[PDB]
Amino acid sequence: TMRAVKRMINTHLEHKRFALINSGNTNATAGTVQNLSNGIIQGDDINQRSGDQVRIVSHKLHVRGTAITVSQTFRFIWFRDNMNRGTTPTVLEVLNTANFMSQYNPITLQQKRFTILKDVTLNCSLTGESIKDRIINLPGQLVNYNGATAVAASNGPGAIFMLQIGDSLVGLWDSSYEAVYTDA
Amino acid sequence: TMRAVKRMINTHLEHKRFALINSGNTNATAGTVQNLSNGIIQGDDINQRSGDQVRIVSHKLHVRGTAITVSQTFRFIWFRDNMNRGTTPTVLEVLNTANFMSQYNPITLQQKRFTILKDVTLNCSLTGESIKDRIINLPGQLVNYNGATAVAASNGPGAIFMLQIGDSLVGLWDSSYEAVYTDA
Amino acid sequence: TMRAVKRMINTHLEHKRFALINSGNTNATAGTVQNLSNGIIQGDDINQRSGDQVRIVSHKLHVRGTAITVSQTFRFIWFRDNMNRGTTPTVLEVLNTANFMSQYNPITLQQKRFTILKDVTLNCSLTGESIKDRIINLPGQLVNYNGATAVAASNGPGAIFMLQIGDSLVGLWDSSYEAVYTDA
Amino acid sequence: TMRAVKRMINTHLEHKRFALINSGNTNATAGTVQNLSNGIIQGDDINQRSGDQVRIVSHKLHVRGTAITVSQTFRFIWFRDNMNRGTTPTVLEVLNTANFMSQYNPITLQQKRFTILKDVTLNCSLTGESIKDRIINLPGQLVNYNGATAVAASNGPGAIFMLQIGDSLVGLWDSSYEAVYTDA
Amino acid sequence: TMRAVKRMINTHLEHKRFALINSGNTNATAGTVQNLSNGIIQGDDINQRSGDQVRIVSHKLHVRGTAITVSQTFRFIWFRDNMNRGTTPTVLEVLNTANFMSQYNPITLQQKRFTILKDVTLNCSLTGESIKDRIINLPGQLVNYNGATAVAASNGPGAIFMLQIGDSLVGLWDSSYEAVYTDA
Amino acid sequence: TMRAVKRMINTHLEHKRFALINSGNTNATAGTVQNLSNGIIQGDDINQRSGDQVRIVSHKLHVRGTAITVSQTFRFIWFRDNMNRGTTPTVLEVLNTANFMSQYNPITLQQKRFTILKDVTLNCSLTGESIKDRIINLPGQLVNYNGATAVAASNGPGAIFMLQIGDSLVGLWDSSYEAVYTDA
Amino acid sequence: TMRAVKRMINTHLEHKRFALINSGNTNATAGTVQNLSNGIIQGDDINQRSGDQVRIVSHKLHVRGTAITVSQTFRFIWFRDNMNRGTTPTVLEVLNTANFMSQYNPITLQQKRFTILKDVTLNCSLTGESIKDRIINLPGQLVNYNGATAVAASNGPGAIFMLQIGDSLVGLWDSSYEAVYTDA
Amino acid sequence: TMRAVKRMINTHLEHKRFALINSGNTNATAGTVQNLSNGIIQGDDINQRSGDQVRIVSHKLHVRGTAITVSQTFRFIWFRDNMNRGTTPTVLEVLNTANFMSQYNPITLQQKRFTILKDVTLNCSLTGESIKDRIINLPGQLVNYNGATAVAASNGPGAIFMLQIGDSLVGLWDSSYEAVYTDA
Amino acid sequence: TMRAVKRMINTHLEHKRFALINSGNTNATAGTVQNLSNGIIQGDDINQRSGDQVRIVSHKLHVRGTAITVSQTFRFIWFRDNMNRGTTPTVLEVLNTANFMSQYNPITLQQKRFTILKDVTLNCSLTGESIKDRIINLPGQLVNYNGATAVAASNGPGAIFMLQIGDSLVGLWDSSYEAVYTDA
Amino acid sequence: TMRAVKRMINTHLEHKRFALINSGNTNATAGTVQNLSNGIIQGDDINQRSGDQVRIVSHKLHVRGTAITVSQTFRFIWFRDNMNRGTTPTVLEVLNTANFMSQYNPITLQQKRFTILKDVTLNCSLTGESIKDRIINLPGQLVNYNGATAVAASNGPGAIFMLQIGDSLVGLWDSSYEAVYTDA
Amino acid sequence: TMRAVKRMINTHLEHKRFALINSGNTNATAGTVQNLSNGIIQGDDINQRSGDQVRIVSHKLHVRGTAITVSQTFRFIWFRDNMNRGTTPTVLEVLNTANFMSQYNPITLQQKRFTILKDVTLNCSLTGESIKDRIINLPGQLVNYNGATAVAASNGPGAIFMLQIGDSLVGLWDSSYEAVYTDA
Ligand SMILES: [Ca+2]
Ligand SMILES: [Ca+2]
Ligand SMILES: [Ca+2]
Ligand SMILES: [Ca+2]
Ligand SMILES: [Ca+2]
Ligand SMILES: [Ca+2]
Ligand SMILES: [Ca+2]
Ligand SMILES: [Ca+2]
Ligand SMILES: [Ca+2]
Ligand SMILES: [Ca+2]
Ligand SMILES: [Ca+2]
Ligand SMILES: [Ca+2]
Ligand SMILES: [Ca+2]
Ligand SMILES: [Ca+2]
Ligand SMILES: [Ca+2]
Ligand SMILES: [Ca+2]
Ligand SMILES: [Ca+2]
């Protein structure tokens, strides 16, 4: 009945909820890393937290790419930083080289610095489907924080991020994110 | 046999049926909300109701988008308003911000004001597939009404709606809907 | 075992076979209804029948649409008329309104006048895939006739039809149909 | 409990019946092939068929030879053509060489193009028994047809034939044949 | 343990292999029939045969179409001729009418002259995906031959073919085929 | 078990087939010995062999005699030479004396040099039945060869022969023979 | 139990990791063969090896094609060379003919010189989706080497390769590859 | 058997060994952090490693303090950095304040950035026992590295360190360390 | 009931047989490699093969050395090349150095390129036993070929060879070889 | 109980006995075949036989070689001729080529014309052991004869022989033989 | 189930291999000791090691002697030095006296300083067999080393050696050695 104890435990805990949107970004050939969980700050509201831990019950990521000028590729890597000490990770920490085709960095994946949640490649064609999107929903895990406010120094172990990278600087991408979490 | 009892009960109940069509609508960047169950009004006909309750056995939504002038995105959110007190809900009650990429409103979803039945995004490309459609069929639930006629004030707990929102004002969408319901 | 005697029974019965083709038709905004089983007439040949009943073992419908002039939609509704009294059914008997987005007629579906076998929508784009097709194969049922020849008055309960309806008058569609049937 | 079911199925099926006679033919040193099942044509009578299949329950062949001028040999080969595509098969399809002593064609027998039902050799002597006959009765099989009328093009898989070949051109042979068949 | 006999048996039998390619053919509105297994001729090599039988363990067909001048359809029907007596079958033997939309010939399918292995339609659009392909792998059956060399008269019962038919004469199609077979 | 396995082994083996005719020979008072299996030579065709062994599944001998000038006797001895070293055996190897009434050679039979398959005597009368024939079908055994071509030196252990001997030189006899064999 | 033992063994072995990228290659009508595992050289780093064996736990191949000038096809064949003696295999070793439609080489596949891991065809259309990609992850096997450095002479049994071949010289393809391997 | 497995595995693995000494250091009131596992570098010797992981079977730390000028306290904190990304951690990451009496940093301990292996305080008195020492032996865990050589950037998750802090700058402390590890 | 199957399958398969003799060879200080199974070529005779596989049931090697001028050593290594791609292997592929005392090549033996069947050393003395010989019989395995004729290019995986090497150029060695094989 | 009955049967049967010696023969490079059982002739003595059969219970062969002029090899092949028709077999019937190194004749061994009882090679050296001998005892089999006296024509199925062949004409060999046989 | 784990463990470990040859040495009356395992040095190649331990799975020693001038004796003692501290053992450490007939040193054998693997004496006669050889294969044990390179100081506990001693200074001996070892 351990599955029953877990359930009733959860019925006593508020499932707080945080939403984020990030629209109108340029595709990046060298890549960028975007914060997802950083925006849950200390405070008393439904989308805030008490202390330096929350536990994500589920979270959802929506990504979108639109080709501009040339047909092009957008890659989105949704990941957990298991070992974050107050930074936004770099592209080269996640990828072997800063290229949209690159495989993961062998060292950081060997030691499990990161866990990859989803790796999505969208090809947007100006002679075909020039707009593409993907939404992904996943159960979550503990998130630890190193500080109270929405700055990079507050990220901690379990922080959630998304790396974007592609083969042009000209196309535009949008994202949004929701986390449902307890905070007991 | 409680399953055979349900079966036998439903065979004594008329399965009334209501149909609706809504076409030639422009895409909305701030969103709109369409009524679906509101059109079942008090009366004696096959697509009407006695009293202020019906029970939807099954219902079906057909949505369609056509890109005009620019390639563009159409989002359709089919939802149940569990707590309706005589209104058509606003876009911002359902979505955190009035943007086609937005996640759900954290507060109204935490409290289960709404239940999302299906959330559909169609990307219509003028260099590709410019017309897209989707039909979804689902078992239904109780619908309560707050009045006799087809006005917002008659919507009640269980009312069914569709939110439309997109990234352009220029393309056109169409929808249709059927509900099969008992009224005993 | 009955599943066995059923097997042995069928091995003593000739599986007669009827094929039909219907090419180069215009898309119809008000819709049309095409005959499928009507062409099995009284006679002694492999694609004919003795008496006024056959039993369809399996039947197969192939539909195809080609956009002309504008990107457009073709809908094909394969159906059985459970109650036919010597007619070709009208579009409005099947659909609530004569529009390619319409839901079914609530009255005729409530009373089970028709059974929908498959409902197929093909979106043909002159900036994308302008030619689309679908083949569907299904087990069949009894077909009764009201006369000997290939005229509407000969359709009877169980007659098989296809409704075609779309959003333009200028695209072209094709269909073909096969029925494999016993006639004992 | 099938055996008794086979019996019961058969009691519901008309056992149609077809008879043929073919008298006064000359012995052939190069052989000839005679039709037996071909004469069952599409029609409504007791010795006709609905559609392009019948199932022979039993069939019977009677052959007879009479020596004239010299003592001589008549051979009769009763056979099924499992693969007929609308022909009367040739002597060389069945026999390795066109001689009354020949063994079967190795290729057509290997691939089971033909099944030999009975192979009968009668030696008719003008100093002994100058007239000889043989009657053979066997259970039958499915017969498929490729058309409606009594022409070679209507023979199909399962067609029944008799090859006659001997060592003189002058003796006379007679045959007759009956098929009892269902036609459900 | 009798299932392991089959396996044990097959480890003692050489699995010979034959490959074929057939590139750059025009789409045909009246259709053509292409040989697939005919090219396995008598001889001592890995892609030849001893005698007039082989047993296909598996075989693979790859088809491809490219639109030229107009958007168009290519249909490919992979089939076994269960009753071949030394021909390449005609289009009308397989199809009711010589049209890319046609259903199968009712007579030849009734009598099981042919067994359809796969029926594939590719729609190639010059405003979309102008090149399409399909690869299909299936277990095989006995193949009998009527002669030694790669001519039509050598086809026999079990011979494997592909019918090609489409709605234009101008597009080009390619095919390739492999059979893995035992020859004991 | 062993019964099914044997059956299954044979389903994977080509049953090759060889046919032979030998017409119009004179009755021989000193006897002759005719080759039957010798004519299966090395090669790739249906009536040839790989290597120096085949296994006869079944074989059939047809013999015929016709009296000329005087009533007379024809004897046909169908036999296997279990020990053949590249010869056509002599009459005296098989028969004690070279006379149509003779019993077998005591020595060669004691040591099982030969196995008698069938011994047939036909008395043909010019005042009665002047023409007689007999067909015999038997399961077969291994046949080894000592060479590749249809010459006496290629006969080997298991070779099949027929001795003919009679009481006149003037009558004529005919024979034919078939062997069905595997060659794995 | 041997299952949990596989578990405990592997937790004591370092899972070394190697990554590779190969961008901006022209499509090849005669094909090329690319090295994948060759780049793991003798050394002490995370992406190197001790001795001449490693065991690939998992490996991942990402392929991508972009049509240039004409719509065109790119095929990628990921394979293991079970028998490599210090070479990069040739296109004719893997394919019956050097054509993007070709089936596999009958001889090298019969003898299991190669094991095909995945065979991918991407059709890239300049009127449609001009950019396409595919990522494939598979468990791996032992890899033996014939030398220490990243040259063809160091490939050995188990070496991993990708063959690229298409129908134009003008389009561009990219690939990347990761192997996770033990080196105990 | 299970516990035997672990023990059997280990007899097949070389237990490499690394020793370190660090003598004659001043007591630090603000503290210092010393590297312990960092000195195991890539190479082939008994005290080196292949790749970027080793597994410490056991490790031993010896610490010593000598009071000089004033009686004083030396604290030594042996710890594992579970999340190291290529640094030597600071005193303030481990201790709430940089004082020898401080409790641990609440945040880094909450999130398990560090695991404390042992925390030892030696009070050295110039009127009593002026020299004190402690040796501690513990089983070990996996160590991951971020580089090949003995620099801070090579430290990785599982790196082992010792923090020293006290209440004078004048006393002297010594330490030494051994790790016994597998490297398979 | 499974061991009986093996035995039963083999009784239906011809045990073909190939013999070879290779007399009067000089002893070689740098070694030579002799072909043994290469001489079985495609064809229809008892010592030939159909296709590119045979299965050796048993094979026998006889080797002999005679000292001339000086007492000397002859070594013979009977081996299977598991990975042959159409060559005669070199001495250095099999042996670490080209010397009659050499141990095997570490790399090719590690990866199982070769399987050593028998390694025989004969010391022939002009003051003692100047002639020595050895005969070895072993069960065999599958042999694959890469072509039809007796050239090195036709050797394939499973090819059988003998390496000869010694300490003089002047003595003479002889060999002979037989393989008994199935070829189904 | 096959063991007891068999023993008792033999106690009632005279075990007759025949001895032979054959001294002072030259080594033969083309080989010779010597008779062993032939010398048991019809008669009433202990070393003779009644009729044309005996059963060898046991037999013993002693062979010896003496080098003269040159060190040389003597081979002795003791064999049974299972199919003898009154000859002394030739060397080429037994050996592939007439050389002391030859393997057996593939054809005559395949068909089991001969059974090899023992194959012995003696290397006689004028600088070592110049005289060698070997004695071999085996259980025997049935021997059939084709005549009464000690001439080649009396040899029959089961006759026992010895083939001698070597690499010189000048050395001398001796043999002796005994057969113990029943003659009931 | 510990023979399964042992087996499974070893399938994950590279079996490295080292080969050695040592030709053309003089017989020694006072003896010599040759190194065998010392040549496995630290490095990354197939015949090298990581760290200071390997585990020999099997090893093989080949020894050979040739008499020169006088008939003479060669003795070879293959042994493991269980206690080596970085030397090459002396002859008197192994043998009681430095004479080829000596028994072992009582003190070093009592304390098990050495384990004798094989002790071989070859008597080479210039009036008989002047060349003799022996190959010995044995399972191995752990080998520890005391340094990185192929010098005496690197030998450690488990080092493998061969002592050679004889009764002449003028004959020549050869040896070779192979170790197969894991290095995990
Ligand atoms: Ca909290
Ligand atoms: Ca109500
Ligand atoms: Ca009629
Ligand atoms: Ca009817
Ligand atoms: Ca019928
Ligand atoms: Ca065959
Ligand atoms: Ca397009
Ligand atoms: Ca051939
Ligand atoms: Ca054969
Ligand atoms: Ca390794
Ligand atoms: Ca190294
Ligand atoms: Ca490591
Ligand atoms: Ca073969
Ligand atoms: Ca007597
Ligand atoms: Ca007797
Ligand atoms: Ca080691
Ligand atoms: Ca001597």
Side-chain angles (χ1 to χ4, degrees), chain B:
Chain B
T1 170
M2 299 319 302
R3 195 196 181 287
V5 41
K6 161 75 179 193
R7 187 93 177 185
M8 192 194 310
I9 289 174
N10 278 302
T11 81
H12 296 265
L13 311 188
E14 178 174 345
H15 291 221
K16 292 184 180 180
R17 269 186 103 107
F18 166 80
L20 165 76
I21 195 162
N22 182 191
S23 52
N25 307 115
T26 45
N27 208 350
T29 57
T32 65
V33 172
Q34 310 296 318
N35 276 259
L36 299 174
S37 52
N38 183 261
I40 308 173
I41 68 167
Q42 285 180 15
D44 305 332
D45 212 346
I46 186 179
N47 69 338
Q48 294 175 329
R49 64 185 153 96
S50 187
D52 280 339
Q53 280 188 345
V54 299
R55 179 177 290 288
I56 298 182
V57 176
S58 65
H59 56 170
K60 175 160 30 167
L61 178 64
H62 197 338
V63 299
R64 177 184 191 254
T66 301
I68 302 179
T69 308
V70 290
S71 302
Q72 61 192 272
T73 299
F74 298 84
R75 179 177 181 187
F76 307 88
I77 313 173
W78 191 14
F79 68 100
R80 168 159 50 245
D81 187 339
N82 307 131
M83 300 182 177
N84 199 99
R85 303 167 82 102
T87 65
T88 300
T90 66
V91 170
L92 284 174
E93 281 184 78
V94 176
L95 292 181
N96 186 61
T97 55
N99 185 275
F100 79 103
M101 282 295 288
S102 185
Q103 301 286 327
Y104 306 130
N105 180 317
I107 294 165
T108 61
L109 272 287
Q110 174 189 73
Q111 69 198 216
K112 300 189 172 55
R113 188 183 302 188
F114 307 109
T115 297
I116 308 304
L117 308 181
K118 201 86 174 72
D119 197 326
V120 170
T121 291
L122 302 181
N123 304 128
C124 294
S125 173
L126 287 171
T127 55
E129 295 305 295
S130 61
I131 303 169
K132 289 181 175 183
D133 68 335
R134 173 76 92 75
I135 59 207
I136 314 105
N137 182 74
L138 295 168
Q141 289 194 11
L142 179 64
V143 181
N144 304 274
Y145 290 80
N146 279 306
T149 66
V151 296
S154 294
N155 289 326
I160 304 303
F161 300 94
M162 188 199 70
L163 186 158
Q164 197 282 322
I165 192 165
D167 76 326
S168 175
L169 298 171
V170 187
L172 296 173
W173 62 270
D174 315 291
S175 68
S176 64
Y177 173 82
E178 156 199 278
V180 178
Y181 58 96
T182 62
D183 187 30

Side-chain angles (χ1 to χ4, degrees), chain H residues 16 31 36 43 52 56 64-65 72 79 82 84 87 104 107-108 110 114 121 126 150 152-153 167 175-176 181:
Chain H
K16 291 185 186 179
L36 297 171
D52 284 333
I56 292 180
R64 183 184 190 251
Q72 62 190 269
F79 68 99
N82 304 133
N84 199 99
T87 63
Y104 304 135
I107 291 168
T108 62
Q110 176 189 71
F114 305 113
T121 289
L126 291 173
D167 72 335
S175 76
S176 66
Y181 58 98

Side-chain angles (χ1 to χ4, degrees), chain C residues 43-44, chain D residues 43-44:
Chain C
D44 299 336
Chain D
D44 305 329

Side-chain angles (χ1 to χ4, degrees), chain G residues 29-151:
Chain G
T29 56
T32 66
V33 177
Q34 311 288 327
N35 280 262
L36 296 178
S37 55
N38 178 261
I40 303 170
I41 70 166
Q42 286 179 12
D44 303 334
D45 212 350
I46 186 170
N47 64 342
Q48 293 178 328
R49 60 184 157 95
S50 177
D52 280 339
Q53 291 190 335
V54 302
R55 185 175 290 277
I56 295 175
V57 175
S58 69
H59 58 168
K60 186 155 72 195
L61 178 68
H62 192 351
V63 294
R64 179 185 192 252
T66 297
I68 295 167
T69 305
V70 289
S71 297
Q72 60 191 270
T73 296
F74 296 82
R75 175 177 181 189
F76 304 92
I77 313 181
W78 189 13
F79 68 101
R80 175 181 204 266
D81 184 340
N82 302 132
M83 297 182 182
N84 199 101
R85 303 166 85 99
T87 64
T88 300
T90 70
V91 171
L92 287 165
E93 277 183 275
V94 177
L95 293 180
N96 189 61
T97 53
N99 185 269
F100 77 104
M101 284 288 296
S102 183
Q103 303 285 328
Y104 308 132
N105 180 316
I107 294 172
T108 65
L109 268 294
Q110 174 188 73
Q111 71 196 212
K112 300 181 172 38
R113 190 187 298 191
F114 307 111
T115 299
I116 304 308
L117 305 181
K118 203 75 180 195
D119 196 330
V120 178
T121 293
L122 306 180
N123 305 129
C124 298
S125 176
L126 290 175
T127 57
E129 294 306 287
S130 62
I131 302 171
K132 286 184 182 184
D133 76 298
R134 180 81 46 89
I135 182 94
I136 310 106
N137 185 64
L138 295 169
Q141 295 207 349
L142 179 65
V143 183
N144 298 269
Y145 291 80
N146 278 305
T149 68
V151 300

